[PDB]
Amino acid sequence: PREFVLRPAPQGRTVRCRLTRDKKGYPSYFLHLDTEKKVFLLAGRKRKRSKTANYLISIDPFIGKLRSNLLGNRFTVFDNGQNPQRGYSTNVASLRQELAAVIYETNVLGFRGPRRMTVIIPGMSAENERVPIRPRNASDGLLVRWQNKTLESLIELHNKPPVWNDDSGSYTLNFQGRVTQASVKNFQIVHADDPDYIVLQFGRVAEDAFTLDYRYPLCALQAFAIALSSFD
Ligand X SMILES: CCCCCCCC[N+](C)(C)CCCS(=O)(=O)[O-]
Distance CA 192, CA 198 (A): 11
Kindly list the residues in this chain that would bind its own copies in the complex (CB under 8 A): 48-51, 69-71, 73-74, 106, 123-126, 155, 191, 193-194, 196-197
Figure out which of the listed residues 59, 143, 154, 155 binds ligand X, where binding follows CB under 6 A. 155
For its own copies, the closer CB: 91 or 139:
139
- 155 C-beta neighbours (distance < 10 Å), count: 17
In the bound complex, which residue of the shown chain has the CB atom lying closest to ligand X? 72
At residue 101's C-alpha, the angle toward residues 98 and 104, to 5°, is: 165
Residue 199 interacts with which of its own copies, ligand X, none, CB < 5 to 8 Å by class? ligand X
Amino acid, res. 148: N
Contact 216, 8 (CB under 8 A): yes
Residues 6 or more apart whose CB falls under 8 angstroms from that of 74 comprise: 68, 101, 102, 103, 104, 143
Residue 216 interacts with which of its own copies, ligand X, none, CB < 5 to 8 Å by class? ligand X
At residue 158's C-alpha, the angle toward residues 180 and 187, to 5°, is: 5
* Interface with ligand X, residue 154, by CB under 6 A: no
For its own copies, the closer CB: 26 or 111:
26
Q: In angstroms, what is the minimal distance from the CB of 219 to ligand X? A: 13
Q: In angstroms, what is the minimal distance from the CB of 217 to ligand X? A: 5
Cα 148 to chain centroid distance, Å, stands at: 22
Contact 17, 30 (CB under 8 A): no
Figure out which of the listed residues 10, 27, 72, 123 binds ligand X, where binding follows CB under 6 A. 72
Name the segment binding ligand X (CB under 6 A); options: 27-35, 37-45, 66-74, 205-213.
Answer: 66-74
Q: Residues in the site for ligand X, rule: CB under 6 A?
A: 12, 70-72, 155, 191, 197, 199, 216-217
